Amino acid sequence: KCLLCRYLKERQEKFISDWKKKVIIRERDPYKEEIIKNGEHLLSAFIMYLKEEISLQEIEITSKKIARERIDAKVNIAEFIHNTNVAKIEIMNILTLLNPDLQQYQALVKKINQFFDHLIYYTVHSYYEQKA
Amino acid sequence: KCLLCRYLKERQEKFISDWKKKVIIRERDPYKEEIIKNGEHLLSAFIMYLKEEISLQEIEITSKKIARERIDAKVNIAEFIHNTNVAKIEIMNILTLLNPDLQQYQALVKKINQFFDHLIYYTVHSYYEQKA
Ligand SMILES: [Cl-]
Ligand SMILES: [Cl-]
Ligand SMILES: [Cl-]
């Protein structure tokens, strides 16, 4: 019941390589390598979430990690928002190209939104909680 | 060419009333009244954006204003993200109920995402830039 999931699972490496070229990563960033690892991990979590194999609470560990890294990198936390949205936009593009029917499209858009909304909300919340 | 706009334009006072019941806004907030006015303004801007009457750049000044107010309120900036998402979710619910076909649904989802992503990104960006 999820071609999008199958597509992303098979194309994980390609998806991340393409995403890396579109994100904002500063050469000075001490965690620039972790940015990629976090992305790889969260793409995997996204697939599992669409398959209803994890709950959203399970990404909160990663969100706290990202937040702490961003604090230490001394970068505007909105860059993380931008970089996350690059991935979301591409996933939406892939969903469109797979050409699901309306019912399926609607179900997947809800899950996509729930995942990314939580990731962004929790990471920014955590950034401010930890920086305090 | 957009029933969603007409619905929101007509039901605007009610939409805001319902939204106010679901958001994080404390009576101690020095800008509690402005939060509602900002909401009213941005709902109008959203409608104009759907109608292709404004560009996304035109909400950046409002984002900077919100960010300044949030700094002064001494709240976690993620509360703004939560509050914005409450509106987006309800808009998505209204879109679903209005029963568009897939093509129209996709076109509006893209505009909804673009508007809200820009609002969240620019406000959080400005919050960090203004706070130092
Ligand atoms: Cl769901
Ligand atoms: Cl109320
Ligand atoms: Cl201002």
From Swiss-Prot, chains A, B:
S-S bridge residues: none
List the source organism.
Bacillus anthracis
Say which domain of life the source belongs to.
Answer: Bacteria
Q: Is this entry keyworded Membrane?
A: no
Mind telling me what this protein is named? Uncharacterized protein pXO2-61/BXB0075/GBAA_pXO2_0075
Q: What is the lineage of its organism?
A: Bacteria, Bacillati, Bacillota, Bacilli, Bacillales
Q: Where is the signal peptide?
A: none
Say if the entry is tagged with keyword Hydrolase.
no
Q: Which Gene3D superfamilies match?
A: Histidine kinase N-terminal domain (1.10.490.70)
- What CDD domains does its record include? GS_BA2291-HK-like
Q: Which UniProt keywords apply?
A: Plasmid
